[PDB]
Design a binder for this molecule. Structure first.
Ligand SMILES: N[C@@H](Cc1ccc(O)cc1)C(=O)O
Ligand SMILES: CC[C@H](C)[C@H](N)C(=O)O
Ligand SMILES: [Ca+2]
Ligand SMILES: [Ca+2]
Ligand SMILES: [Ca+2]
Ligand SMILES: [Ca+2]
Ligand SMILES: [Zn+2]
Length: 316
């Protein structure tokens, strides 16, 4: 909408108060004019028609329980934008300040979220398996990272290319969670998953096997479900990324950790300069080794640790 940039206040899904950038024209809309061509948040109103209505509020205060998912989708889209701009000099998901659009209250009791090619979409969950999924900063950043991948590598969403696509979204979702520095970890979706159970999540990058996902190539899923295992085989790559950052000994192979910033630089370089739509795990190792070589030198610790981590997960 055309209007005046304003700043509202509300509470997110987990009851945290935060300020949000809004636009005033009769109503206050969830439209942040301060980031690129805008961040826009919509109400799907329990239906599956997208995007739905640009979120409008009478008084610029967003404290209703119904508001909470909208507050978080809008706020965390902004944090993710900040991460890509400040850390990688990338302006929105296309690198050209594309408007970022999110819809909440998608369907009834919908236990998922997704990038649909155009925008991010968040279910409210059924209150048992999930609370509203925009409450998870790693979730929001995972989904917006699919947009980044769409505009860069374009990894096809099936088999090994799809598992890489999935891992890239887990890696940057997690790096954004660390950037924001609120209860960061190497797990995915812990903030919104199972409000009745402490300490669980959808996936673990540090120990994928904790939730039944492979941590070595020898254990890859070869079946047809989940598009050839894209959320399962991502464990292999996530494990490699965790090792490059944090280090450790995995199946008797030792990796010296080089830290999250360098992990981020190496995978962002691989994503934007070397990976293709059909890149497999072997080609990802090559891309990451070449990216570390470009940044640090063929004989650097960084290159060595990338090699070590891929060796540890059985990827040559
Ligand atoms: N996002 C993942 C994990 C997931 C699976 C089922 C859900 O109901 C929610 C999340 C997927 O779509 O496979
Ligand atoms: C990152 C979590 C969300 C639920 C994603 N669509 C799966 O995985
Ligand atoms: Ca209000
Ligand atoms: Ca966390
Ligand atoms: Ca997390
Ligand atoms: Ca839980
Ligand atoms: Zn995903």
């Amino acid at each position: 909408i055309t209007g005046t940039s304003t700043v509202g206040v509300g509470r997110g899904v987990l009851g945290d108060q935060k300020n949000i950038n809004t636009t005033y024209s009769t109503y206050y809309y969830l439209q942040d004019n301060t980031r690129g061509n805008g961040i826009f948040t919509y109400d799907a109103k329990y239906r599956t028609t997208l995007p739905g209505s640009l979120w409008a509020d009478a008084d610029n205060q967003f404290f209703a329980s119904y508001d909470a998912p909208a507050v978080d989708a809008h706020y965390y889209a902004g944090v993710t934008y900040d991460y890509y701009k400040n850390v990688h000099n990338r302006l929105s998901y296309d690198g050209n300040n594309a408007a970022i659009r999110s819809s909440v209250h998608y369907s009834q009791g919908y236990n998922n979220a997704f990038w649909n090619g155009s925008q991010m979409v968040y279910g409210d969950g059924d209150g048992q398996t999930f609370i509203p999924l925009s409450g998870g900063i790693d979730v929001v950043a995972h989904e917006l990272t699919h947009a980044v991948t769409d505009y860069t590598a374009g990894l096809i969403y099936q088999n090994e290319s799809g598992a890489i696509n999935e891992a890239i979204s887990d890696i940057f979702g997690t790096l954004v969670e660390f950037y924001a520095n609120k209860n960061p970890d190497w797990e995915i979706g812990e903030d919104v998953y199972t409000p009745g159970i402490s300490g669980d999540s959808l996936r673990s990058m540090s120990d994928p096997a904790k939730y039944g996902d492979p941590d070595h190539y020898s254990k890859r899923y070869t079946g047809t479900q989940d598009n050839g295992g894209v959320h399962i085989n991502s464990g292999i790559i996530n494990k490699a990324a965790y090792l490059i950052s944090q280090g450790g000994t995995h199946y008797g192979v030792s990796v010296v950790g080089i830290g999250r910033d360098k992990l981020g630089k190496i995978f962002y370089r691989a994503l934007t300069q070397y990976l293709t739509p059909t890149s497999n795990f072997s080609q990802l190792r090559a891309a990451a080794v070449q990216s570390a070589t470009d940044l640090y030198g063929s004989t650097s610790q960084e290159v060595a640790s990338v090699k070590q981590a891929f060796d540890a997960v059985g990827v040559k």
